[PDB]
Design a binder for this molecule. Structure first.
Ligand SMILES: *[C@@H]1O[C@H](CO)[C@@H](O[C@@H]2O[C@H](CO)[C@@H](O)[C@H](O)[C@H]2NC(C)=O)[C@H](O[C@@H]2O[C@@H](C)[C@@H](O)[C@@H](O)[C@@H]2O)[C@H]1NC(C)=O
Ligand SMILES: *[C@@H]1O[C@H](CO)[C@@H](O[C@@H]2O[C@H](CO)[C@@H](O)[C@H](O)[C@H]2NC(C)=O)[C@H](O[C@@H]2O[C@@H](C)[C@@H](O)[C@@H](O)[C@@H]2O)[C@H]1NC(C)=O
Ligand SMILES: *[C@@H]1O[C@H](CO)[C@@H](O[C@@H]2O[C@H](CO)[C@@H](O)[C@H](O)[C@H]2NC(C)=O)[C@H](O[C@@H]2O[C@@H](C)[C@@H](O)[C@@H](O)[C@@H]2O)[C@H]1NC(C)=O
Ligand SMILES: *[C@@H]1O[C@H](CO)[C@@H](O[C@@H]2O[C@H](CO)[C@@H](O)[C@H](O)[C@H]2NC(C)=O)[C@H](O[C@@H]2O[C@@H](C)[C@@H](O)[C@@H](O)[C@@H]2O)[C@H]1NC(C)=O
Ligand SMILES: CC(=O)N[C@H]1[C@@H](O[C@H]2[C@@H](O)[C@@H](CO)O[C@@H](O[C@H]3[C@H](O)[C@@H](O)[C@@H](O)O[C@@H]3CO)[C@@H]2O)O[C@H](CO)[C@H](O)[C@@H]1O
Ligand SMILES: CC(=O)N[C@H]1[C@@H](O[C@H]2[C@@H](O)[C@@H](CO)O[C@@H](O[C@H]3[C@H](O)[C@@H](O)[C@@H](O)O[C@@H]3CO)[C@@H]2O)O[C@H](CO)[C@H](O)[C@@H]1O
Ligand SMILES: [Ca+2]
Ligand SMILES: [Ca+2]
Ligand SMILES: [Mn+2]
Ligand SMILES: [Mn+2]
Lengths: 236, 237
């Protein structure tokens, strides 16, 4: 059982995507997770984008878990250096039919009033009380308090290539971050048992958020654009 | 305890390096693991390069294992597409004071006569009876029959950037291969317990080999050059 999709660019009204909150597809084909007005990113923004169809990560009959690989390119432009950009974007896996969670440092995937399980890879740009120096890549399981973290230097407004790979036989989730214009490479990996934290069917996608009003800073913002995205999963 | 070294280039007669067999440092400073005469790679070649000083990967007293990260760039030029280039290069970890093993598909690290333990990451270009489609990255533990492998497409004569990282806490060995001119990225990882396969002190380095004469093909060859190399390791306590 193999499922896969590829997006070289994005089209307005793409029927295979489910856009939520502020997420929208620009005219020149980029998926803008968070709000940008007249070329300027705004604060108090949150948006998600999910693949329209659910994917099966494991089968309770056979007990088998899927292996998958997804690659995407994103760009984060931070026009206002002072006082601090926020908040970041993530790639996540969650039960189907979920609603956008809290914004800010919760990236829009965590909902305290009614938490749902999730596995996510974050590209965190704002340092909350629970965070190590930013920016950093982090692996999150049911919480934004990462199990593993690695710092990285952002290519402001540049293109970033990401590769996320999960091997069921070893339970290893490894992600690679590359900034071609700088030639830098960042790698992080950890063990995660999907069967143990997620249901048989899930949704995959992205979620991002800009500065929360509580911070009283309109400069706490940046863009969170997704340029392309391909996904592939295999359940034996 | 933290050890590390960085070679942004290679000098003739590198005091910090121990060259074996065909390995040699060119005039323009690249480390040529296998023989190349007048700009042409030859068959029947094998060479290794080890960091002169041994490194401690684990301590029997504390039971602690080290974490490490190594980055290097290499280039493999395949002048003769037919009938098949060979054999590939590897980065390996082995007990100190070992001798070059068999060439060919054994890369010069495996010795059937008297086998010694080793952990290696291979960049295999010839398909032996025990191999999947080539080229591929492979993780080898005491054998060239990889535990895990992933295929990749070579940038002939181009530059390749490699990042190998080992985290003791999870026992995860993850390697990343990138070809900047093509923008391609390959990743592979697996679990390896160093403490369980290697001695407390080891040697780290590279080894490569070209077509073995038994194949009766002088075209079974290619270059195996290392452009730069940095290593780092933290053994807490
Ligand atoms: C942050 O964004 C939210 C969503 O865009 C704002 O809430 C929505 O604001 C609309 C415009 O005023 C209003 O029609 C909607 O009812 C409201 N949604 C609800 C029910 O929460 C949120 O705050 C609102 O908008 C600002 C401009 C003020 O007018 C507030 O009084 C509203 O509640 C935004 N945060 C702020 C206060 O900037
Ligand atoms: C929010 O971003 C603004 C634009 O980046 C900051 O203003 C800019 O501050 C620069 C100083 O580093 C100055 O050269 C620019 O001309 C100015 N641009 C504009 C259009 O405002 C702003 O900084 C605050 O406001 C400015 C006017 C000064 O009073 C600064 O001392 C203030 O810090 C940023 N606000 C914050 C909270 O940092
Ligand atoms: C493959 O490379 C070998 C080097 O590791 C060659 O070994 C030969 O070893 C001899 C013993 O010391 C030495 O005199 C020779 O110079 C050297 N090769 C030559 C001729 O330069 C091996 O050469 C073949 O095998 C040896 C034992 C002799 O019979 C040579 O005449 C053969 O050419 C190389 N094999 C091939 C097929 O080229
Ligand atoms: C070993 O590599 C050689 C160089 O690529 C091959 O020879 C070259 O083959 C080309 C077409 O395949 C031909 O246009 C070139 O002129 C020729 N170059 C030379 C110097 O020979 C060689 O291919 C075969 O063997 C050679 C000797 C010729 O007879 C070719 O016509 C053959 O295809 C490669 N060896 C093999 C067996 O593939
Ligand atoms: C959880 C979350 O969404 N957090 C937001 C938030 O972050 C906090 C920080 O900005 C922090 C730094 O001073 O300030 C907090 O709020 C202030 C508050 O405004 C004051 O009245 C007083 O209570 O002090 C606290 C801090 O101690 C913010 O909640 O905002 C930033 C944007 O600037 C990010 O969006 C975080 O994700
Ligand atoms: C063991 C080793 O290092 N392998 C070399 C070797 O690989 C074999 C293949 O090239 C294979 C292709 O036909 O041929 C083998 O040898 C022949 C032998 O010469 C014949 O007489 C007959 O017995 O069949 C066998 C194989 O069936 C080679 O051992 O050579 C290649 C060079 O192209 C590589 O260097 C491998 O690493
Ligand atoms: Ca954060
Ligand atoms: Ca091989
Ligand atoms: Mn974080
Ligand atoms: Mn192999």
């Amino acid at each position: 059982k193999t499922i896969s999709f590829n997006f070289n660019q994005f089209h307005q009204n793409e029927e295979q995507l489910k856009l939520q909150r502020d997420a929208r597809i620009s005219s020149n084909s980029v998926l803008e997770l968070t709000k940008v007005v007249n070329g300027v990113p705004t604060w108090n923004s949150t948006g998600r984008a999910l693949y329209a169809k659910p994917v099966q990560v494991w089968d309770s009959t056979t007990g088998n878990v899927a292996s998958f690989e997804t690659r995407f390119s994103f760009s984060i432009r931070q026009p206002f250096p002072r006082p601090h950009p926020a908040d970041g974007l993530v790639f996540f896996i969650a039960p189907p039919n979920t609603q956008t969670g809290e914004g800010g440092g919760y990236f829009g995937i965590y909902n305290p009033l009614s938490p749902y399980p999730f596995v996510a890879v974050e590209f965190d740009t704002f340092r909350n009380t629970w965070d190590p120096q930013i920016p950093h890549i982090g692996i999150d399981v049911n919480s934004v308090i990462s199990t593993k973290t690695v710092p990285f230097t952002l290519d402001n407004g540049g293109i970033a290539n990401v590769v996320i790979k999960y091997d069921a036989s070893t339970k290893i989730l490894h992600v690679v971050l590359v900034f071609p214009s700088l030639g830098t490479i960042y790698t992080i990996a950890d063990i995660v048992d999907l069967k143990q934290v997620l249901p048989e069917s899930v949704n995959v996608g992205f979620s991002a958020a800009t500065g929360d009003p509580s911070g009283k800073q309109r400069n706490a913002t940046e863009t969170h654009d997704i340029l392309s995205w391909s996904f592939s999963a295999s359940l034996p």
